[PDB]
């Protein structure tokens with residue numbers, strides 16, 4: 001994009017592209033998991049108004065990360081998994097400058113990790129179908 | 142300023158920190174069983190410098206960047222090796238080719254695809270082998 005740093009897409013090539021773009025501020029992220037990651041719902045500030053986007057499928061059970069002020073997403077790790085034929089995220093977690101969350105989901109696979117020594121996660125993108133085939137992030141300082 | 146991603150690997154060795162370069166020219170990865178070391182050669186504020194990270198061992202494999210060839214990928218495997226935790230395998234992708242991975246000791250893998258941006262620099266820890274490595278990213 002427009003001076004943007006986009007990192008990954010980890011996962012399979014199934015499903016449909018989704019691209020959140022960068023946010024001014026991520027308010028909350030909400031991961032839906034059972035066996036795998038079903039989806040992610042994101043809520044953020046763009047242009048001064050609140051927006052919420054719904055990625056991946058609609059299944060699974062929510063795990064909500066509510067960023068306090070001064071809390072930033074500075075890590076994301078998971079496991080790329082075969083699952084009933086499709087390659088999707090079997091596990092997904094996140095770290096802020098305060099706590100870790102997850103990983104959510106119960107299907108192991110080939111792991112990925114993204115420690116962000118400097119910067120934060122500013123947005124998301126990836127692939128979505130019945131479940132969360134794949135996920136990447138936007139970065140910024 | 143910068144966007145630093147990772148340090149994948151162990152906590153032994155001494156830290157290193159190339160900082161971001163203007164352009165990267167070549168990366169050289171010495172490996173045997175594991176990843177012994179990396180040489181980087183790059184331009185920086187009108188100079189040309191080289192740095193060697195980690196040890197003296199291994200057989201080299203060179204990535205020489207062409208006109209408008211960026212590093213847009215790094216990937217390998219964190220490893221326990223006769224004690225120390227080190228890069229056991231390591232490879233890069235340019236926007237034209239994949240290279241490697243070099244080294245022959247699996248373990249727990251990592252992948253950093255860059256969909257938008259480039260690797261402009263390295264940091265990490267090194268000793269006799271390449272204990273840990275991370276990268277600086279830029280648009």
Ligand SMILES: C[C@@H]1O[C@@H](O)[C@@H](O)[C@H](O)[C@@H]1O
Nearest residue numbers: 033034035061103104105
């Ligand atoms: C109630 C449980 O909460 C977490 O442990 C999830 O990983 C499970 O999938 C389930 O939602």
Ligand SMILES: C[C@@H]1O[C@@H](O)[C@@H](O)[C@H](O)[C@@H]1O
Nearest residue numbers: 035082083084085086130
């Ligand atoms: C390969 C997969 O096998 C089982 O997991 C089924 O329930 C799926 O629908 C698919 O058939």
Ligand SMILES: [Cl-]
Nearest residue numbers: 156157158159
């Ligand atoms: Cl140094």
Ligand SMILES: [Cl-]
Nearest residue numbers: 163164165261
């Ligand atoms: Cl470069």
Ligand SMILES: [Cl-]
Nearest residue numbers: 191192193194
């Ligand atoms: Cl040196």
Ligand SMILES: [Cl-]
Nearest residue numbers: 211258259280
């Ligand atoms: Cl570029």
Ligand SMILES: [Cl-]
Nearest residue numbers: 225268269270
């Ligand atoms: Cl060592």
